[PDB]
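Researcher: Sequence of Ras GTPase-activating protein 1 follows. Predict its structure.
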Amino acid sequence: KRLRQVSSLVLHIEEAHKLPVKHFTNPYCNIYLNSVQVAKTHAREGQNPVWSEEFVFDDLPPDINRFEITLSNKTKKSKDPDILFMRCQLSRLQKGHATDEWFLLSSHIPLKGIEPGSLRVRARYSMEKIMPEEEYSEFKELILQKELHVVYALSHVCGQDRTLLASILLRIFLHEKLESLLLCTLNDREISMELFRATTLASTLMEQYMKATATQFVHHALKDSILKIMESKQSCELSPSKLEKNEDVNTNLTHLLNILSELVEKIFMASEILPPTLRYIYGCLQKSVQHKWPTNTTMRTRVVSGFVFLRLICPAILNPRMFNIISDSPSPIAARTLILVAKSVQNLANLVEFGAKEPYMEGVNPFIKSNKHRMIMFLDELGNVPTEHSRTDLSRDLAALHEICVAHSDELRTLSNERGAQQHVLKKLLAITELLQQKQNQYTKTN
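Model: Prediction complete. C-alpha coordinates:
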Protein backbone atom coordinates (compact mmCIF):
# COMPACT_ATOMS: atom_id res chain seq x y z
CA LYS A 1 0.00 0.00 0.00
CA ARG A 2 1.37 3.42 1.04
CA LEU A 3 3.26 5.05 3.91
CA ARG A 4 1.40 5.84 7.13
CA GLN A 5 2.07 9.29 8.62
CA VAL A 6 1.06 9.57 12.29
CA SER A 7 1.35 12.90 14.11
CA SER A 8 1.35 13.13 17.90
CA LEU A 9 1.81 15.82 20.55
CA VAL A 10 2.68 15.13 24.19
CA LEU A 11 2.20 18.09 26.55
CA HIS A 12 3.40 18.39 30.15
CA ILE A 13 1.81 21.26 32.09
CA GLU A 14 4.28 21.68 34.95
CA GLU A 15 3.63 24.93 36.83
CA ALA A 16 3.00 28.66 36.55
CA HIS A 17 4.90 31.57 38.08
CA LYS A 18 3.80 34.97 39.41
CA LEU A 19 0.25 34.87 38.12
CA PRO A 20 -1.52 38.17 38.93
CA VAL A 21 -3.11 37.88 42.37
CA LYS A 22 -5.89 40.26 41.29
CA HIS A 23 -7.31 37.57 38.99
CA PHE A 24 -6.09 34.14 40.20
CA THR A 25 -7.00 32.21 43.33
CA ASN A 26 -7.57 28.73 41.82
CA PRO A 27 -5.92 28.73 38.38
CA TYR A 28 -6.35 25.91 35.88
CA CYS A 29 -5.35 25.46 32.25
CA ASN A 30 -7.44 24.97 29.12
CA ILE A 31 -5.59 23.19 26.31
CA TYR A 32 -6.39 23.82 22.64
CA LEU A 33 -5.19 22.30 19.38
CA ASN A 34 -5.41 25.28 17.04
CA SER A 35 -8.40 27.03 18.69
CA VAL A 36 -10.32 23.83 19.53
CA GLN A 37 -10.38 22.87 23.21
CA VAL A 38 -9.30 19.28 23.85
CA ALA A 39 -8.40 19.02 27.56
CA LYS A 40 -7.97 20.89 30.83
CA THR A 41 -5.94 20.55 34.02
CA HIS A 42 -7.16 20.39 37.60
CA ALA A 43 -7.58 23.55 39.66
CA ARG A 44 -4.58 24.33 41.87
CA GLU A 45 -3.80 26.75 44.68
CA GLY A 46 -2.57 30.32 44.65
CA GLN A 47 -0.39 32.33 42.28
CA ASN A 48 2.42 29.78 41.74
CA PRO A 49 0.52 26.52 41.15
CA VAL A 50 2.07 23.18 40.22
CA TRP A 51 0.06 20.78 38.03
CA SER A 52 2.44 18.16 36.56
CA GLU A 53 -0.23 16.72 34.28
CA GLU A 54 0.48 14.88 31.02
CA PHE A 55 -1.70 14.95 27.90
CA VAL A 56 -1.20 12.69 24.87
CA PHE A 57 -2.77 13.76 21.57
CA ASP A 58 -2.17 10.95 19.09
CA ASP A 59 -3.00 11.02 15.37
CA LEU A 60 -3.11 14.79 14.96
CA PRO A 61 -5.13 15.91 11.92
CA PRO A 62 -2.93 17.46 9.23
CA ASP A 63 -4.36 20.97 9.81
CA ILE A 64 -3.09 21.32 13.40
CA ASN A 65 -0.40 24.01 13.25
CA ARG A 66 -0.20 25.00 16.93
CA PHE A 67 -1.38 24.41 20.47
CA GLU A 68 -2.70 27.16 22.73
CA ILE A 69 -3.12 27.20 26.51
CA THR A 70 -5.52 29.47 28.39
CA LEU A 71 -5.30 29.99 32.15
CA SER A 72 -8.69 30.42 33.84
CA ASN A 73 -9.79 30.96 37.44
CA LYS A 74 -12.08 28.34 38.95
CA THR A 75 -14.71 30.31 40.85
CA LYS A 76 -18.39 30.42 41.78
CA LYS A 77 -18.89 34.20 41.52
CA SER A 78 -19.47 33.85 37.76
CA LYS A 79 -18.46 31.65 34.86
CA ASP A 80 -14.75 30.94 35.02
CA PRO A 81 -12.93 33.87 33.35
CA ASP A 82 -10.40 33.46 30.55
CA ILE A 83 -7.48 35.57 31.81
CA LEU A 84 -4.11 34.61 30.31
CA PHE A 85 -2.91 32.58 27.34
CA MET A 86 0.13 31.46 25.37
CA ARG A 87 0.43 30.01 21.88
CA CYS A 88 3.08 27.73 20.37
CA GLN A 89 3.33 26.92 16.67
CA LEU A 90 4.28 23.31 15.95
CA SER A 91 6.80 24.64 13.42
CA ARG A 92 9.00 25.77 16.33
CA LEU A 93 9.06 22.26 17.85
CA GLN A 94 11.96 20.09 16.72
CA LYS A 95 10.46 16.78 15.61
CA GLY A 96 11.00 14.12 18.26
CA HIS A 97 12.91 16.31 20.73
CA ALA A 98 11.23 17.04 24.06
CA THR A 99 11.38 20.78 24.72
CA ASP A 100 11.18 22.32 28.19
CA GLU A 101 10.52 26.06 28.32
CA TRP A 102 8.77 28.80 30.25
CA PHE A 103 6.41 30.86 28.10
CA LEU A 104 5.65 34.51 28.77
CA LEU A 105 1.87 34.70 29.08
CA SER A 106 -0.41 36.98 27.07
CA SER A 107 -3.75 38.35 28.22
CA HIS A 108 -7.35 38.19 27.05
CA ILE A 109 -8.05 41.31 29.14
CA PRO A 110 -6.32 44.64 29.81
CA LEU A 111 -3.85 44.21 32.66
CA LYS A 112 -2.95 47.90 33.23
CA GLY A 113 0.68 47.50 34.28
CA ILE A 114 0.27 44.13 36.04
CA GLU A 115 2.89 41.57 35.03
CA PRO A 116 1.30 38.53 33.33
CA GLY A 117 3.63 35.77 34.52
CA SER A 118 4.93 32.63 32.88
CA LEU A 119 3.91 29.02 32.28
CA ARG A 120 6.29 26.05 32.13
CA VAL A 121 5.41 23.52 29.41
CA ARG A 122 7.21 20.38 28.28
CA ALA A 123 6.28 19.44 24.72
CA ARG A 124 7.24 16.66 22.32
CA TYR A 125 5.92 16.90 18.76
CA SER A 126 6.66 13.61 16.99
CA MET A 127 6.08 12.19 13.51
CA GLU A 128 6.05 8.44 12.89
CA LYS A 129 6.65 7.04 9.39
CA ILE A 130 5.14 3.56 9.17
CA MET A 131 5.61 1.37 6.10
CA PRO A 132 3.15 -1.39 5.20
CA GLU A 133 3.43 -4.29 7.62
CA GLU A 134 4.85 -6.75 5.06
CA GLU A 135 8.04 -4.66 4.79
CA TYR A 136 8.87 -5.48 8.44
CA SER A 137 8.55 -9.23 7.83
CA GLU A 138 12.22 -10.24 8.06
CA PHE A 139 12.66 -7.70 10.87
CA LYS A 140 9.80 -9.28 12.82
CA GLU A 141 11.10 -12.81 12.18
CA LEU A 142 14.47 -11.93 13.73
CA ILE A 143 12.83 -10.50 16.88
CA LEU A 144 10.54 -13.50 17.48
CA GLN A 145 13.54 -15.85 17.22
CA LYS A 146 13.56 -18.41 19.99
CA GLU A 147 16.75 -17.40 21.84
CA LEU A 148 15.88 -13.67 21.79
CA HIS A 149 19.42 -12.54 20.92
CA VAL A 150 18.11 -9.26 19.48
CA VAL A 151 15.93 -8.78 22.58
CA TYR A 152 19.00 -9.20 24.80
CA ALA A 153 20.98 -6.66 22.76
CA LEU A 154 18.12 -4.14 22.78
CA SER A 155 17.87 -4.30 26.57
CA HIS A 156 21.63 -3.81 26.90
CA VAL A 157 21.59 -0.70 24.69
CA CYS A 158 18.50 0.96 26.23
CA GLY A 159 19.59 2.67 29.44
CA GLN A 160 16.65 4.97 30.19
CA ASP A 161 14.38 3.42 27.51
CA ARG A 162 13.50 0.58 29.91
CA THR A 163 9.75 1.23 30.02
CA LEU A 164 9.33 2.15 26.35
CA LEU A 165 11.21 -0.89 25.03
CA ALA A 166 9.31 -3.15 27.44
CA SER A 167 5.95 -1.69 26.35
CA ILE A 168 6.74 -2.11 22.65
CA LEU A 169 8.24 -5.59 23.06
CA LEU A 170 5.33 -6.74 25.24
CA ARG A 171 2.68 -5.59 22.75
CA ILE A 172 4.57 -7.28 19.90
CA PHE A 173 4.89 -10.67 21.60
CA LEU A 174 1.29 -10.43 22.83
CA HIS A 175 0.15 -9.69 19.28
CA GLU A 176 1.94 -12.86 18.11
CA LYS A 177 0.75 -14.99 21.08
CA LEU A 178 4.40 -15.44 22.11
CA GLU A 179 4.37 -13.61 25.44
CA SER A 180 5.21 -16.92 27.14
CA LEU A 181 8.44 -17.30 25.15
CA LEU A 182 9.46 -13.70 25.88
CA LEU A 183 8.72 -13.63 29.62
CA CYS A 184 9.91 -17.17 30.39
CA THR A 185 13.24 -16.84 28.56
CA LEU A 186 14.09 -13.45 30.08
CA ASN A 187 13.05 -14.54 33.58
CA ASP A 188 15.22 -17.65 33.17
CA ARG A 189 18.23 -15.58 32.09
CA GLU A 190 17.60 -13.16 34.96
CA ILE A 191 17.71 -16.01 37.49
CA SER A 192 20.75 -17.44 35.70
CA MET A 193 23.05 -14.46 36.38
CA GLU A 194 22.28 -13.93 40.10
CA LEU A 195 16.67 -11.76 42.96
CA PHE A 196 14.31 -9.83 40.66
CA ARG A 197 14.52 -7.04 43.25
CA ALA A 198 16.44 -5.02 40.64
CA THR A 199 14.50 -3.03 38.04
CA THR A 200 15.55 -5.15 35.08
CA LEU A 201 13.83 -5.68 31.74
CA ALA A 202 12.38 -8.96 33.03
CA SER A 203 10.86 -7.30 36.10
CA THR A 204 9.21 -4.41 34.23
CA LEU A 205 7.96 -6.84 31.58
CA MET A 206 6.36 -8.96 34.31
CA GLU A 207 5.00 -5.79 35.92
CA GLN A 208 3.44 -4.58 32.67
CA TYR A 209 2.13 -8.06 31.86
CA MET A 210 0.55 -8.54 35.30
CA LYS A 211 -1.11 -5.12 35.30
CA ALA A 212 -2.78 -6.22 32.05
CA THR A 213 -3.68 -9.83 32.94
CA ALA A 214 -4.26 -10.05 36.72
CA THR A 215 -6.67 -7.14 37.28
CA GLN A 216 -9.77 -9.28 37.87
CA PHE A 217 -7.95 -11.78 40.05
CA VAL A 218 -7.10 -8.83 42.30
CA HIS A 219 -10.69 -7.55 42.20
CA HIS A 220 -12.24 -10.98 42.82
CA ALA A 221 -9.92 -11.58 45.79
CA LEU A 222 -9.69 -8.15 47.46
CA LYS A 223 -12.73 -6.00 46.58
CA ASP A 224 -15.25 -7.63 48.92
CA SER A 225 -12.72 -7.87 51.75
CA ILE A 226 -11.58 -4.25 51.46
CA LEU A 227 -15.19 -3.05 51.12
CA LYS A 228 -16.00 -4.66 54.48
CA ILE A 229 -12.93 -2.96 55.97
CA MET A 230 -13.98 0.40 54.50
CA GLU A 231 -17.37 0.63 56.25
CA SER A 232 -16.04 -0.85 59.51
CA LYS A 233 -15.47 1.00 62.77
CA GLN A 234 -13.94 -1.79 64.87
CA SER A 235 -10.24 -1.21 65.48
CA CYS A 236 -7.46 -3.73 64.88
CA GLU A 237 -4.75 -1.67 66.57
CA LEU A 238 -2.12 -3.70 68.43
CA SER A 239 0.66 -1.19 69.15
CA PRO A 240 0.15 -0.03 72.77
CA SER A 241 1.47 3.41 71.81
CA LYS A 242 -1.31 3.86 69.23
CA LEU A 243 -4.07 2.38 71.44
CA GLU A 244 -6.53 4.94 72.73
CA LYS A 245 -7.23 3.71 76.25
CA ASN A 246 -10.37 1.80 77.28
CA GLU A 247 -9.58 -0.55 74.37
CA ASP A 248 -9.27 -4.32 74.65
CA VAL A 249 -6.34 -5.29 72.42
CA ASN A 250 -7.76 -8.84 72.39
CA THR A 251 -10.99 -7.90 70.63
CA ASN A 252 -8.88 -5.94 68.14
CA LEU A 253 -6.66 -8.96 67.51
CA THR A 254 -9.72 -11.22 67.27
CA HIS A 255 -11.20 -8.93 64.61
CA LEU A 256 -7.93 -8.86 62.65
CA LEU A 257 -7.76 -12.67 62.63
CA ASN A 258 -11.34 -12.93 61.33
CA ILE A 259 -10.51 -10.42 58.58
CA LEU A 260 -7.30 -12.20 57.59
CA SER A 261 -8.90 -15.65 57.57
CA GLU A 262 -11.75 -14.57 55.28
CA LEU A 263 -9.44 -12.62 52.96
CA VAL A 264 -6.80 -15.36 52.73
CA GLU A 265 -9.53 -17.84 51.82
CA LYS A 266 -10.81 -15.38 49.20
CA ILE A 267 -7.34 -15.13 47.64
CA PHE A 268 -6.94 -18.91 47.47
CA MET A 269 -10.32 -19.28 45.74
CA ALA A 270 -9.99 -16.36 43.32
CA SER A 271 -6.86 -18.10 41.98
CA GLU A 272 -9.04 -19.88 39.41
CA ILE A 273 -9.52 -16.53 37.62
CA LEU A 274 -5.82 -16.06 36.80
CA PRO A 275 -5.28 -16.59 33.05
CA PRO A 276 -3.47 -19.83 32.17
CA THR A 277 -0.57 -18.07 30.43
CA LEU A 278 0.37 -16.13 33.57
CA ARG A 279 0.13 -19.34 35.59
CA TYR A 280 2.35 -21.07 33.02
CA ILE A 281 4.91 -18.27 33.42
CA TYR A 282 4.81 -18.77 37.20
CA GLY A 283 5.55 -22.47 36.73
CA CYS A 284 8.49 -21.59 34.48
CA LEU A 285 9.79 -19.32 37.24
CA GLN A 286 9.64 -22.33 39.57
CA LYS A 287 11.42 -24.58 37.07
CA SER A 288 14.19 -22.05 36.43
CA VAL A 289 14.78 -21.57 40.16
CA GLN A 290 14.76 -25.35 40.69
CA HIS A 291 17.40 -25.73 37.98
CA LYS A 292 19.71 -23.17 39.61
CA TRP A 293 19.17 -24.04 43.30
CA PRO A 294 17.95 -27.64 43.70
CA THR A 295 18.85 -27.42 47.42
CA ASN A 296 16.89 -24.22 48.19
CA THR A 297 13.58 -26.09 48.17
CA THR A 298 11.90 -22.94 49.52
CA MET A 299 13.09 -20.68 46.70
CA ARG A 300 10.45 -22.03 44.30
CA THR A 301 7.75 -20.51 46.50
CA ARG A 302 9.72 -17.31 47.17
CA VAL A 303 10.05 -16.47 43.47
CA VAL A 304 6.30 -16.78 42.84
CA SER A 305 5.03 -14.97 45.94
CA GLY A 306 7.31 -12.01 45.16
CA PHE A 307 5.15 -11.30 42.12
CA VAL A 308 1.73 -12.54 43.26
CA PHE A 309 1.91 -10.93 46.71
CA LEU A 310 4.87 -8.56 47.19
CA ARG A 311 4.32 -6.79 43.85
CA LEU A 312 0.62 -7.40 43.14
CA ILE A 313 -1.62 -8.28 46.10
CA CYS A 314 0.06 -6.55 49.05
CA PRO A 315 0.43 -3.13 47.33
CA ALA A 316 -3.21 -3.43 46.27
CA ILE A 317 -4.26 -3.78 49.91
CA LEU A 318 -2.07 -0.82 50.88
CA ASN A 319 -3.10 1.48 48.00
CA PRO A 320 -6.50 0.21 46.79
CA ARG A 321 -7.28 3.44 44.90
CA MET A 322 -4.68 2.89 42.16
CA PHE A 323 -6.13 -0.54 41.28
CA ASN A 324 -9.75 0.48 40.52
CA ILE A 325 -10.76 -1.44 43.66
CA ILE A 326 -12.29 1.58 45.41
CA SER A 327 -12.44 5.21 44.30
CA ASP A 328 -13.03 6.66 47.78
CA SER A 329 -10.00 6.97 50.04
CA PRO A 330 -9.93 4.73 53.14
CA SER A 331 -10.68 5.93 56.64
CA PRO A 332 -7.81 6.39 59.13
CA ILE A 333 -9.18 3.35 60.98
CA ALA A 334 -9.70 1.54 57.67
CA ALA A 335 -6.21 2.59 56.56
CA ARG A 336 -4.69 1.27 59.79
CA THR A 337 -6.49 -2.07 59.43
CA LEU A 338 -5.40 -2.25 55.78
CA ILE A 339 -1.77 -1.68 56.78
CA LEU A 340 -2.04 -4.38 59.46
CA VAL A 341 -3.64 -6.81 57.00
CA ALA A 342 -0.97 -6.06 54.38
CA LYS A 343 1.86 -6.64 56.88
CA SER A 344 0.32 -9.99 57.84
CA VAL A 345 -0.30 -11.06 54.24
CA GLN A 346 3.27 -10.05 53.39
CA ASN A 347 4.79 -12.09 56.22
CA LEU A 348 2.56 -15.06 55.39
CA ALA A 349 3.57 -14.87 51.72
CA ASN A 350 7.21 -14.88 52.86
CA LEU A 351 6.55 -17.99 55.03
CA VAL A 352 7.84 -16.06 58.05
CA GLU A 353 6.30 -15.09 61.38
CA PHE A 354 6.63 -11.74 63.12
CA GLY A 355 9.66 -11.36 65.37
CA ALA A 356 11.34 -9.16 67.98
CA LYS A 357 11.31 -6.24 65.53
CA GLU A 358 7.48 -6.09 65.76
CA PRO A 359 6.71 -7.55 69.20
CA TYR A 360 3.12 -6.25 69.20
CA MET A 361 2.25 -8.34 66.11
CA GLU A 362 2.98 -11.75 67.66
CA GLY A 363 -0.77 -12.36 68.04
CA VAL A 364 -0.99 -13.01 64.29
CA ASN A 365 1.77 -15.63 64.48
CA PRO A 366 -0.54 -18.63 65.19
CA PHE A 367 -2.63 -17.72 62.14
CA ILE A 368 0.51 -17.40 60.00
CA LYS A 369 2.05 -20.63 61.29
CA SER A 370 -1.07 -22.71 60.63
CA ASN A 371 -1.41 -21.31 57.08
CA LYS A 372 2.19 -21.49 55.82
CA HIS A 373 1.67 -24.93 54.25
CA ARG A 374 -1.55 -23.70 52.65
CA MET A 375 0.40 -20.82 51.11
CA ILE A 376 3.11 -23.18 49.81
CA MET A 377 0.44 -25.44 48.27
CA PHE A 378 -1.41 -22.44 46.82
CA LEU A 379 1.66 -21.19 44.95
CA ASP A 380 2.80 -24.60 43.68
CA GLU A 381 -0.66 -25.18 42.20
CA LEU A 382 -0.62 -21.67 40.70
CA GLY A 383 2.12 -22.68 38.27
CA ASN A 384 0.64 -26.17 37.92
CA VAL A 385 -0.41 -25.65 34.30
CA PRO A 386 1.81 -27.37 31.67
CA THR A 387 -8.76 -16.14 19.14
CA GLU A 388 -9.56 -13.84 22.13
CA HIS A 389 -5.94 -12.63 22.30
CA SER A 390 -4.68 -9.07 22.79
CA ARG A 391 -3.48 -7.41 19.58
CA THR A 392 -1.75 -4.14 18.71
CA ASP A 393 -0.83 -1.98 15.72
CA LEU A 394 1.96 -4.30 14.60
CA SER A 395 3.48 -2.16 11.84
CA ARG A 396 3.51 0.88 14.14
CA ASP A 397 5.29 -0.96 16.96
CA LEU A 398 7.73 -2.60 14.53
CA ALA A 399 8.47 0.85 13.10
CA ALA A 400 9.08 2.15 16.62
CA LEU A 401 11.44 -0.75 17.35
CA HIS A 402 13.31 -0.09 14.09
CA GLU A 403 13.76 3.55 15.12
CA ILE A 404 15.37 2.35 18.36
CA CYS A 405 17.67 0.11 16.31
CA VAL A 406 18.64 3.05 14.09
CA ALA A 407 19.36 5.39 17.01
CA HIS A 408 21.44 2.69 18.76
CA SER A 409 22.95 1.17 15.61
CA ASP A 410 26.58 1.90 16.50
CA GLU A 411 26.25 0.36 19.96
CA LEU A 412 24.48 -2.64 18.44
CA ARG A 413 27.46 -2.79 16.07
CA THR A 414 29.81 -3.01 19.06
CA LEU A 415 27.50 -5.77 20.28
CA SER A 416 27.67 -7.69 16.99
CA ASN A 417 31.49 -7.59 17.18
CA GLU A 418 31.58 -9.68 20.37
CA ARG A 419 32.04 -13.45 20.44
CA GLY A 420 28.99 -15.60 21.07
CA ALA A 421 25.98 -17.28 19.52
CA GLN A 422 24.23 -13.90 19.22
CA GLN A 423 26.88 -12.72 16.73
CA HIS A 424 25.31 -13.70 13.40
CA VAL A 425 21.77 -12.52 14.20
CA LEU A 426 23.08 -9.15 15.40
CA LYS A 427 24.94 -8.85 12.09
CA LYS A 428 21.67 -9.62 10.29
CA LEU A 429 19.86 -7.10 12.52
CA LEU A 430 22.28 -4.39 11.38
CA ALA A 431 21.82 -5.29 7.71
CA ILE A 432 18.03 -5.40 8.10
CA THR A 433 18.04 -2.06 9.94
CA GLU A 434 19.94 -0.25 7.19
CA LEU A 435 17.80 -1.89 4.50
CA LEU A 436 14.61 -0.77 6.25
CA GLN A 437 16.00 2.77 6.38
CA GLN A 438 16.83 2.70 2.66
CA LYS A 439 13.28 1.55 1.90
CA GLN A 440 11.69 4.12 4.22
CA ASN A 441 13.60 6.71 2.18
CA GLN A 442 12.08 5.28 -1.01
CA TYR A 443 8.54 5.59 0.34
CA THR A 444 9.25 9.17 1.43
CA LYS A 445 10.74 10.09 -1.96
CA THR A 446 7.66 8.96 -3.94
CA ASN A 447 5.26 10.82 -1.59
